[PDB]
Design a binder for this molecule. Structure first.
Ligand SMILES: [Mg+2]
Ligand SMILES: [Mg+2]
Ligand SMILES: [Mg+2]
Ligand SMILES: [Mg+2]
Ligand SMILES: [Mg+2]
Ligand SMILES: [Mg+2]
Ligand SMILES: [Mg+2]
Ligand SMILES: [Mg+2]
Ligand SMILES: [Mg+2]
Ligand SMILES: [Mg+2]
Ligand SMILES: [Mg+2]
Ligand SMILES: [Mg+2]
Ligand SMILES: [Mg+2]
Ligand SMILES: [Mg+2]
Ligand SMILES: [Mg+2]
Lengths: 111, 97, 109, 176, 46, 189, 26, 41
RNA sequence: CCUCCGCAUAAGCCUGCGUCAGAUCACACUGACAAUUAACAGCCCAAUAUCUACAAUCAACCAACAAGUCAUUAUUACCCUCACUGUCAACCCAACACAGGCAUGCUCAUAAGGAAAGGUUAAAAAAAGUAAAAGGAACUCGGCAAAUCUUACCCC
RNA sequence: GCUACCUAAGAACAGCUAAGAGCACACCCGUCUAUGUAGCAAAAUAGUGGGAAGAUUUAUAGGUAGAGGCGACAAACCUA
RNA sequence: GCUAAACCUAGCCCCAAACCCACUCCACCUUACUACCAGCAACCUUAGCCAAACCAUUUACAUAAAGUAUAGGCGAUA
């Protein structure tokens, strides 16, 4: 979860268990002709790679195998009538690779 | 071009206000209220020049001792600077000495 | 020389870029060879239920009536801690032996 | 599978999807903590459905099919995250009696103002800390002049704001 | 020689000199931040 | 919206608003109050002064921010819509807005413009009643569900038996999750 | 805007003088 | 500005109307119109 | 036809000639959309003891002085595993699309990278060159500059 | 963050001849000249030159501050 | 007839009166905006321009008594 405080674990405390997950992702069309088996999300900025792996297998039951992350800088050079900058919000990008050759391709919304 | 094209909206003035028609009422409360109050005890203004005419330098000195204990910090500093300037102007500059 | 820009991880030199990071809430620690040790216990696992046989959907229908609010005060919920508390004529002293402590809030969300 | 990021493909490109009546916070109060927990993971499954679509609406330069149901669902979780937070803040008062689930204290910073300094959950006592003992929560009385100057800057802005509205009300009474 | 390029930038040297830790380190420097929050600056430091 | 915004006939987020109101205009504001406001949306009224006087009409849009009513198809002027090319486009008689107190609410049976007071009847409670007569003036003015709607029968299930046991723990007691380890204490400062 | 009235008025009796020398009446 | 001059136009035009038949910038510019209409009188 | 550059890294800046659209010397500007994926590089170490005289230089002869850039052990403690961050560009510092400034590694003529000429005419003056009869410092403050390469001596 | 010096830990120095040696690149400096003088440039360009295994150059972080710093004294330099 | 000209109203000043202000969530003295590991700590006469036609002592920081008593290179002035 995000905008919360995590309990601090010393050595033999319980497993940290999350009910009512705060962070919401979104699935996008890749823009650069991604491989087959590679499916691309938009992670919100406070979410770990393994925190996405367990999030898909937990809820959406997707057998994910390899995850890569990168942080995309939002462009800041957007000026106003007040000549002050407007920052488009920087985001995190997943590259989820599916196991078992599950072979997903992005569908055509808006036919 | 400083002159304006449309002539301004007419200033409608009510000469018979509650304030205009009864202006000066309870002046001469001293001479014919058998001197219970003074006409200077009805001027509603600032607390330092309440019935006292004075000068400019005399106004800034009187403001500084009557009010300057409870003035804002820079407004006091712009008051000490102005007494210091008017002291150097009235006493040391000008014609007629 | 830019002051009003946000200081993110992308800005400094090599020593600076690797340190800061985004709001990660990291998991493990670093030992002696820059060898990361991912603790399984500090990884948040999700408690997701099952959803089959479940009657609720993300929207309700408009034919459901309008009703007025009731901010559930602590006074209101004591009036349902009364069902054994009228027969005597539920409380925990500390939270040291509890696993979900309330005031030193042990849990998450 | 991944198909539950998407709605039913009989609704693809339909420019109108009939989905209304967001979860009003009274109706969530009646349900149990079991079912509110299961309701959260259904709105999660459908908010994630809608955020793909609006990111794909923006990609193919089209309007959203029905933007009016995105804000139905986000305030439904907010009502759900309000009702659950009532029940903990209900019985945290019963079992402890003390608000602010995060402990904190009113601490005066360097700059003389007081803040609500929230606490940060450490494994050592506060007298052994390298970093926390480098932090300073006190006055150092050179600040006391700059406290007064900001106290007058706040008071002057407040005095300006109170005096516009009396001038604005008079020009309203000079017209009506 | 030519005489304009007198800001050879780096970010270690900028924040060690004009950082927020350096401003709060010396009691003289704390007054700098106060004169900037009084004026109401957007960036009180680097 | 900017402070000192000028409330137009077009809605405050329309494209046809932002053509008129970019975020940098600071035109001088208008003068206007008293939320007890008898002119609601859909009432039948008449028009006192100005052109098209005395006629009756329903109000379509009411704008409280500038004390306006837009009566139905009346006090209109004629404008071109579309036009798209070097040709005309069709015409609409487009309603100009009507400022409040130029418009009086009309009697339901007597069909006369009367001032209205909000009297508290005993029957409950605060309804619009006329001046010259009595005759309280009311407030004038199928869904079958899809797959993502719940029902009416389930949204009031009243599942909550209100126990003292902290949702994060009752999910854990009901999903078969066992935790041997206890929480070691922490110095919160 | 300047605060006057008389200066603006005399400009009105000067502009309307120019009208009747630019486009005179029949 | 309390008490700023409103009728500056009619002080310029009483000078300029005696300088309309001049040459150069003297028939328009008031700085140059005065120094010639004084010498014209 | 030039290549006195180029390609990476470091530093720096922070999306700044990718796609679609658009307004409006010549058609990097504006709006929307897209990307840069770690394995290389960052981000490191359980204590308390206790050890470390013999340069580097092809390290061998030799030869030094200015005397030098790299090492553990003993016991206790220990078995969770591959998270986070940087990754774009024609770029940075010089008010600029500035002949300037800018560390290293490879390339030492280039497999990278580029264009001195908007078009014309072919006046002066000016500039950058090249060629010169005969003479060869006569010029000039002075062989300055250019072209050729060299002799001897003073002053400090 | 320029520069004066210093500290820490780094880097660079082809080729040829035989050591604060010689010729000579990279690199550093800036002798004399011509252009430039609101310039390409708030000190540059083109040649020409001095040094180029060291009292050399240089990247990085740190230190010393104005009644003062620092200085192979030019009263130099310390953000034109 | 192009350039342009004009416009009231944002707001503000001055007083009166009244003593002003701080926790949505998370983040912030480390390189602030950074979830998480074992030593220090605040209190020190303002000076100077200026006036003295230089300058060296000195030079202001309710009403009424009163610019009085006093002070002062007995002087500027206080
Ligand atoms: Mg690259
Ligand atoms: Mg320059
Ligand atoms: Mg090429
Ligand atoms: Mg030409
Ligand atoms: Mg010849
Ligand atoms: Mg001669
Ligand atoms: Mg001669
Ligand atoms: Mg020569
Ligand atoms: Mg040598
Ligand atoms: Mg040599
Ligand atoms: Mg030196
Ligand atoms: Mg000397
Ligand atoms: Mg000298
Ligand atoms: Mg003097
Ligand atoms: Mg003198």
């Amino acid at each position: 979860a995000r905008n919360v405080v995590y309990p601090l674990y010393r050595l033999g405390g319980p497993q940290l268990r999350v009910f009512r997950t705060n962070f919401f992702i979104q699935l996008v069309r890749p823009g650069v002709a991604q491989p087959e088996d590679t499916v691309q999300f938009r992670i919100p900025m406070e979410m770990t790679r393994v925190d996405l792996r367990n999030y898909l297998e937990g809820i959406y039951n997707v057998p994910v195998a390899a995850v890569r992350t990168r942080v995309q800088h939002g462009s800041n050079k957007r000026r106003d009538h007040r000549n002050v900058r407007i920052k488009k919000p920087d985001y995190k990008v997943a590259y989820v690779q599916l196991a078992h050759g599950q072979t997903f391709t992005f569908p055509d919304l808006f036919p | 071009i400083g002159i304006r094209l449309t002539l301004p909206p007419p200033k409608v003035v009510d000469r018979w206000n509650e304030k205009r028609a009864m202006f000066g009422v309870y002046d001469n409360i001293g001479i014919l209220g058998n001197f219970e109050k003074h006409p200077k005890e009805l001027i509603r203004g600032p607390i330092w020049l309440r019935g006292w005419k004075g000068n400019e330098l005399q106004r800034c000195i009187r403001k500084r001792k009557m009010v300057g204990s409870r003035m804002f910090a820079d407004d006091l500093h712009n008051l000490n600077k102005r007494i210091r300037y008017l002291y150097k102007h009235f006493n040391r500059h000008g014609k007629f000495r | 020389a830019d002051r009003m820009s946000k200081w993110t991880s992308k800005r400094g030199p090599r020593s600076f870029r690797g340190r800061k990071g985004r709001g990660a809430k990291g998991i493990g620690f670093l030992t002696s060879g820059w060898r990361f040790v991912q603790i399984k216990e500090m990884v948040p696992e999700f408690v997701v239920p099952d959803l089959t046989g479940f009657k609720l959907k993300p929207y309700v229908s408009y034919l459901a009536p309008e009703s007025e609010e009731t901010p559930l005060t602590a006074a209101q919920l004591f009036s349902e801690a009364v069902a054994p508390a009228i027969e005597k004529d539920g409380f925990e002293p500390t939270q040291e032996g509890k696993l979900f402590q309330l005031y030193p809030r042990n849990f998450l969300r | 599978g991944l198909e539950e990021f998407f709605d039913d493909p009989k609704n693809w490109g339909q420019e109108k999807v009939k989905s209304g009546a967001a979860w009003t916070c009274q109706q969530l109060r009646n349900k149990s903590n079991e079912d509110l927990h299961k309701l959260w993971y259904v709105l999660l499954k459908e908010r994630n459905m809608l955020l793909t679509l609006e990111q794909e609406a923006k990609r193919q330069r089209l309007p959203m099919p029905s933007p009016e149901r995105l804000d139905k669902v986000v305030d439904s979780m907010d009502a759900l995250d309000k009702v659950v937070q009532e029940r903990e803040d209900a019985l945290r008062l019963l079992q402890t009696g003390q608000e602010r689930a995060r402990p904190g204290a009113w601490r005066r910073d360097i700059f003389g103002r007081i803040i609500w300094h929230k606490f940060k959950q450490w494994v050592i006592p506060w007298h052994l800390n390298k970093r926390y003992n480098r932090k300073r929560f006190f006055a150092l009385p050179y600040v006391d002049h700059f406290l007064r100057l900001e106290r007058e800057k706040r008071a002057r802005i407040k005095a300006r704001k109170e005096n516009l509205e009396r001038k604005k009300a008079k020009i309203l009474l000079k017209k009506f | 020689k030519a005489r304009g390029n007198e800001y050879q930038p780096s970010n270690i040297k900028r924040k060690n000199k004009h950082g927020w830790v350096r401003r709060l380190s010396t009691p003289a420097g704390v007054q700098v931040i106060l004169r900037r929050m009084l004026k109401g600056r957007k960036s009180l430091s680097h | 919206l900017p402070p000192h915004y000028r409330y137009g006939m077009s809605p405050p987020g329309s494209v046809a608003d932002k053509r008129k109101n970019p975020p940098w205009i600071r035109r001088r504001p208008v003068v206007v109050s008293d939320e007890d406001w008898y002119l609601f949306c859909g009432d039948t009224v008449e028009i006192l002064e100005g052109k098209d006087a005395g006629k009756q009409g329903k109000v379509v849009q009411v704008i409280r921010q500038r004390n306006w009513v837009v009566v139905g198809g009346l006090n209109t002027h004629y404008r071109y819509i579309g036009k798209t090319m070097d040709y005309r486009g069709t015409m609409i008689p487009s309603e100009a807005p009507l400022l409040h107190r130029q418009v009086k609410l009309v009697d339901p049976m007597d069909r006369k413009p009367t001032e209205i007071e909000w009297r508290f009847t005993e029957a409950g409670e605060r309804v619009r009643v006329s001046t010259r007569s009595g005759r309280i003036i009311p407030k004038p003015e199928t869904w079958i569900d899809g797959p993502k709607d719940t029902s009416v029968e389930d949204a009031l299930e009243r599942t909550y038996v209100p126990c003292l046991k902290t949702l994060q723990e009752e999910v854990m007691e009901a999903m078969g999750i066992k935790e041997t380890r206890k929480y070691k204490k922490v110095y919160w400062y | 805007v300047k605060k006057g009235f008389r200066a603006a008025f005399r400009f009105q009796k000067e502009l309307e003088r120019q009208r009747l020398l630019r486009c005179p009446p029949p | 500005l309390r008490n700023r001059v409103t009728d500056r136009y009619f002080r310029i035009q009483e000078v300029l109307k005696h300088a309309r038949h001049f040459r150069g910038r003297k028939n328009r510019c008031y700085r140059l119109a005065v120094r010639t209409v004084i010498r014209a009188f």
